[PDB]
Amino acid sequence: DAEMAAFGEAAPYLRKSEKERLEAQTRPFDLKKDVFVPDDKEEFVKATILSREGGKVTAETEHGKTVTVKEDQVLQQNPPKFDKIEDMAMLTFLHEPAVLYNLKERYASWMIYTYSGLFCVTINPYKWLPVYNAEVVAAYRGKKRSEAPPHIFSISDNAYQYMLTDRENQSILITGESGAGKTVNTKRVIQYFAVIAAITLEDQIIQANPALEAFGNAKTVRNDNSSRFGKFIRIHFGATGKLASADIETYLLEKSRVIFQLKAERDYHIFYQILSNKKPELLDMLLITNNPYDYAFISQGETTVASIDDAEELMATDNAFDVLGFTTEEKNSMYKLTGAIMHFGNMKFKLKQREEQAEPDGTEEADKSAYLMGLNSADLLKGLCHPRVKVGNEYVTKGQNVQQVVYAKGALAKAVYERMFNWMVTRINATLETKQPRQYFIGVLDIAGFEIFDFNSFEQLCINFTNEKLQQFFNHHMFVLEQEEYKKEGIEWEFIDFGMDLQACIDLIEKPMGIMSILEEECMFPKATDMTFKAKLFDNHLGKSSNFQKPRNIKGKPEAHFSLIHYAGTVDYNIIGWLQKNKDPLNETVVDLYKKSSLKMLSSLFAQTVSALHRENLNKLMTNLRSTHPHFVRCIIPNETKSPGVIDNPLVMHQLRCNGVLEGIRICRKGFPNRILYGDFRQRYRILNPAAIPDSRKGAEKLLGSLDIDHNQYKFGHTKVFFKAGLLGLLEEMRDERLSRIITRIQAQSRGVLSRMEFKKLLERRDS
Amino acid sequence: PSKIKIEFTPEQIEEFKEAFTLFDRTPKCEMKITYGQCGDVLRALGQNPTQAEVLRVLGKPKQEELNSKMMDFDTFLPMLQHISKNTGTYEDFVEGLRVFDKEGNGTVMGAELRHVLATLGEKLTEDEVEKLMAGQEDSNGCINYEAFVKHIMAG
Numbered sequence: 068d069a070e071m072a073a074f075g076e077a078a079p080y081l082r083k084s085e086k087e088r089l090e091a092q093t094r095p096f097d098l099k100k101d102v103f104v105p106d107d108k109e110e111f112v113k114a115t116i117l118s119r120e121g122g123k124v125t126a127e128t129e130h131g132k133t134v135t136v137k138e139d140q141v142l143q144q145n146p147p148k149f150d151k152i153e154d155m156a157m158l159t160f161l162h163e164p165a166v167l168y169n170l171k172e173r174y175a176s177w178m179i180y181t182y183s184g185l186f187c188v189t190i191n192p193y194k195w196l197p198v199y200n201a202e203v204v205a206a207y208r209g210k211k212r213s214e215a216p217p218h219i220f221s222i223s224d225n226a227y228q229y230m231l232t233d234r235e236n237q238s239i240l241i242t243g244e245s246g247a248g249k250t251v252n253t254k255r256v257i258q259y260f261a262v263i264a265a266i267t268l269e270d271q272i273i274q275a276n277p278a279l280e281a282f283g284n285a286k287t288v289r290n291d292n293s294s295r296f297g298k299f300i301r302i303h304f305g306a307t308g309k310l311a312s313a314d315i316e317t318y319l320l321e322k323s324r325v326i327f328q329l330k331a332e333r334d335y336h337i338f339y340q341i342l343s344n345k346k347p348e349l350l351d352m353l354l355i356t357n358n359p360y361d362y363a364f365i366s367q368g369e370t371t372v373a374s375i376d377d378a379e380e381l382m383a384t385d386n387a388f389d390v391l392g393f394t395t396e397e398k399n400s401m402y403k404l405t406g407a408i409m410h411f412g413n414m415k416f417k418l419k420q421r422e423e424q425a426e427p428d429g430t431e432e433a434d435k436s437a438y439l440m441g442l443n444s445a446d447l448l449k450g451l452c453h454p455r456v457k458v459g460n461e462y463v464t465k466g467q468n469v470q471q472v473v474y475a476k477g478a479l480a481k482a483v484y485e486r487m488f489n490w491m492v493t494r495i496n497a498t499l500e501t502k503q504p505r506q507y508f509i510g511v512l513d514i515a516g517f518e519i520f521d522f523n524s525f526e527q528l529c530i531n532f533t534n535e536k537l538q539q540f541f542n543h544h545m546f547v548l549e550q551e552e553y554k555k556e557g558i559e560w561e562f563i564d565f566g567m568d569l570q571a572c573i574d575l576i577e578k579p580m581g582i583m584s585i586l587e588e589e590c591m592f593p594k595a596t597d598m599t600f601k602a603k604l605f606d607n608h609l610g611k612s613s614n615f616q617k618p619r620n621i622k623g624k625p626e627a628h629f630s631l632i633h634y635a636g637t638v639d640y641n642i643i644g645w646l647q648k649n650k651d652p653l654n655e656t657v658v659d660l661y662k663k664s665s666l667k668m669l670s671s672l673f674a675q676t677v678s679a680l681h682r683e684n685l686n687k688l689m690t691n692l693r694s695t696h697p698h699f700v701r702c703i704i705p706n707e708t709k710s711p712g713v714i715d716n717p718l719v720m721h722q723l724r725c726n727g728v729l730e731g732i733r734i735c736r737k738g739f740p741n742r743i744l745y746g747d748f749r750q751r752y753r754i755l756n757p758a759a760i761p762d763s764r765k766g767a768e769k770l771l772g773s774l775d776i777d778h779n780q781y782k783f784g785h786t787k788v789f790f791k792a793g794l795l796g797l798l799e800e801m802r803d804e805r806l807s808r809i810i811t812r813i814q815a816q817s818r819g820v821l822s823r824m825e826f827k828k829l830l831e832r833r834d835s
Numbered sequence: 836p837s838k839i840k841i842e843f844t845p846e847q848i849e850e851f852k853e854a855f856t857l858f859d860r861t862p863k864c865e866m867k868i869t870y871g872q873c874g875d876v877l878r879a880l881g882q883n884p885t886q887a888e889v890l891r892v893l894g895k896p897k898q899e900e901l902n903s904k905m906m907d908f909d910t911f912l913p914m915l916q917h918i919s920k921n922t923g924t925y926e927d928f929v930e931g932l933r934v935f936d937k938e939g940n941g942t943v944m945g946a947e948l949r950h951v952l953a954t955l956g957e958k959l960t961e962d963e964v965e966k967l968m969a970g971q972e973d974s975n976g977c978i979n980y981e982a983f984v985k986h987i988m989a990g
């Protein structure tokens with residue numbers, strides 16, 4: 068417990084007491100009786116064998132039920148020394164209920180992080196725990212994986228040590244479905260490096276997220292604070308490991324949310340933060356009321372969230388902008404454009420008497436919009452109703468009905484908002500860039516997670532396709548590149564097929580003739596419709612692509628056109644408006660007015676397809692990631708009701724299965740997950756036995772051969788020494804132990820010198 | 836204590852008897868030392884024992900015994916003989932300091948080595964570190980750790 072003293076009040080939430088360790092260790096247990104059996108409702112249950120009879124077992128479950136099962140369905144419980152184990156790669160029996168019950172038992176003690184080989188699993192507590200303070204940050208600094216309990220700070224510290232030891236860029240890839248904990252863990256990685264460096268760039272990196280979340284996050288049916296954009300945060304370091312700079316890359320903000328909401332969701336936080344009336348001057352400046360129901364674009368779903376204090380959050384947003392060095396003019400322009408968007412959606416239109424042409428139906432909301440936008444309202448209204456076309460020194464007008472104007476009005480508001488969000492990211496990067504020299508970076512990936520709504524459209528396909536690719540990146544790193552490394556290096560290895568490959572689903576979406584390629588081609592045919600697109604998908608894929616199926620339409624649920632078998636589940640997609648969403652067209656007459664705006668921000672914001680741009684961002688991200696050493700954090704949703712400390716076994720089992728957690732632990736156990744170049748081995752471990760190295764390969768052989776170790780736990784490659792993670796942990800303990808003994812011996816020689824210096828002074832007074 | 840056969844020549848014994856006398860701080864000038872100054876005399880006489888090795892030959896004394904238990908030369912001599920029997924090579928010392936060499940350039944930051952000697956192993960006081968480190972840093976405040984190892988081993 069004294070060894071856990073540095074962690075303070077966080078200590079019981081990170082590691083169990085020595086008293087609990089002795090209680091577990093000695094608890095009643097029989098290796099023969101204490102087993103796990105399958106269960107139709109709970110996946111697996113703990114059971115005690117009562118009788119063994121002709122290949123079948125009769126056992127009593129934890130729920131007081133007598134079940135009869137086959138011997139090959141029975142799985143052994145790990146002895147009590149393994150209770151709440153920190154690394155599941157260390158369990159004697161590795162199977163699904165062993166992993167599930169180890170996770171459940173740690174979660175019941177509020178221990179939300181568990182190592183699983185070289186990666187980590189985290190389960191959403193739905194509760195604040197005192198494990199993320201500056202004292203816990205200090206306590207994790209430089210700790211080896213064995214000496215420190217599992218935490219997001221230790222994954223962050225390990226990545227930093229790999230960076231300096233291997234001299235290579237690192238990535239922290241945080242997976243999970245919507246509401247699993249990716250954004251929370253991303254901000255904890257950032258917090259770790261900011262607080263370590265603090266012991267204003269550090270303040271600025273922490274304040275980047277509240278500013279982005281006001282404009283890029285929103286309440287969805289799955290998450291009260293859902294990220295509606297992807298982001299890759301790079302934390303730059305000098306050659307010796309000092310924090311140097313940071314930068315943020317953002318991907319595909321969900322544009323439709325700005326002007327549209329489904330029943331159980333809100334628009335972006337910022338609108339409600341402003342309307343909170345916490346800063347009444349903002350309402351006066353934006354010429355708005357305090358009622359969200361007065362603004363069409365923002366009040367189609369929900370307007371309040373029980374867990375969010377929009378008044379408190381506007382102060383967090385406004386303070387984030389101050390810390391980030393945004394001027395009053397920059398802050399006010401962002402508020403004004405948000406208010407202008409609110410007014411813009413309230414502009415009504417009617418058909419002319421004798422022609423299918425739109426005309427303004429009142430001009431009050433257009434006047435307010437134009438005023439905030441630095442435009443003339445008559446020019447705005449004429450541009451929307453009669454967009455100009457150039458024909459030999461004349462701007463002839465194109466006719467527009469009310470449907471066309473309403474659509475154009477929406478497209479424009481979505482564009483202003485998206486470009487404003489992109490301006491803000493560029494502006495955050497301008498302050499985060501310090502011009503300080505660097506060599507390395509640790510990148511943190513925070514994507515929008517796997518989601519299934521009652522209505523799934525183009526935005527859900529793009530999101531779910533990102534999650535599919537990220538899962539495949541894990542599969543590739545863990546099971547493909549890993550086995551390839553062994554073979555290239557000449558390590559004796561038999562290829563294992565882990566059954567983790569999502570290529571058929573990925574190909575269906577992104578390859579030629581696939582979903583995106585068909586959509587892109589249809590966007591190039593002027594006469595194409597949502598039903599010519601729907602027919603083309605069916606003709607090319609129904610009965611041909613395993614992952615493409617018919618929709619599973621249910622009465623009281625919205626209509627879908629097809630279903631896609633994703634890694635995390637089958638999703639029913641609605642195809643209406645996908646051509647328009649992909650082309651994303653804009654009224655160029657109004658864009659010219661934005662270019663000539665008296666409001667400098669709108670003027671600068673405006674100074675082929677979404678699927679093509681998405682595909683390009685993804686594969687360019689996947690190649691940045693390929694040049695880094697990835698570290699995975701697998702965030703898990705425990706239940707469907709946001710209940711703290713409650714686990715739903717099938718839901719947790721489903722997530723662990725499709726994440727490939729067990730297969731991932733297996734390759735770490737069976738393979739050699741740690742490796743070091745021969746020259747680098749000599750520099751780090753010659754200290755263990757300098758006499759053994761008085762050729763770098765021969766030296767490594769002689770040194771490792773002289774140690775009292777399991778000689779099966781290391782292998783010699785063409786250029787590297789390979790290790791089991793357990794042997795590396797032991798070698799590191801041996802290195803620290805020997806360093807301590809050497810320092811003690813240097814100190815003894817140092818005491819010798821100091822005493823001899825004093826003795827020489829004493830002799831000089833009498834004898835010398 | 837009794838099992839220790841004294842191997843030193845009578846001339847060495849007289850040489851050690853004088854060094855031991857130079858450490859006398861007794862008010863009556865009785866030519867005795869406290870248990871706590873034994874380490875110092877073993878060191879003045881060419882030995883380099885650890886704090887633990889000194890405490891073992893002293894018979895594991897309490898802090899009270901180190902401060903005020905007196906020792907004569909006849910009790911000291913078998914302790915000097917026993918300590919002289921039992922150190923680490925130049926290579927071990929250089930490898931130990933290389934751990935703190937971030938770049939692998941042959942130097943270590945002065946303030947870092949000072950911190951290591953005052954925190955790790957059998958901690959040296961800030962005063963002992965100051966005295967030992969005096970005039971050993973270059974113009975950039977760095978320490979050539981293999982030159983430093985040669986310096987302490989020749990001391």
Ligand SMILES: COC(=O)N1CCN(Cc2cccc(NC(=O)Nc3ccc(C)nc3)c2F)CC1
Pocket residue numbers: 211212213225228229232233696740741742743792795796799
């Ligand atoms: C167990 O304790 C820890 O977690 N650590 C102890 C100190 N370690 C430093 C260190 C020693 C030996 C080798 C490496 N490098 C290595 O394994 N590289 C590697 C392995 C796999 C892939 C995909 N890419 C690169 C290395 F950094 C790292 C932290």
Ligand SMILES: Nc1ncnc2c1ncn2[C@@H]1O[C@H](COP(=O)(O)OP(=O)(O)O)[C@@H](O)[C@H]1O
Pocket residue numbers: 179191192193194195196243244245246247248249250251252290292293294516702
């Ligand atoms: N480690 C955690 N500690 C406390 N609450 C958490 C933790 N992880 C998630 N939560 C809760 O769950 C919510 C959803 O988490 P979040 O990181 O936004 O999910 P996502 O994976 O969608 O980005 C958080 O806003 C918070 O209320």
Ligand code: VO4
Pocket residue numbers: 243244245246247249250289290292293294295514515516517
């Ligand atoms: O709810 V999420 O942040 O995964 O989008």
Ligand SMILES: [Mg+2]
Pocket residue numbers: 249250292293294513514515
């Ligand atoms: Mg998020």
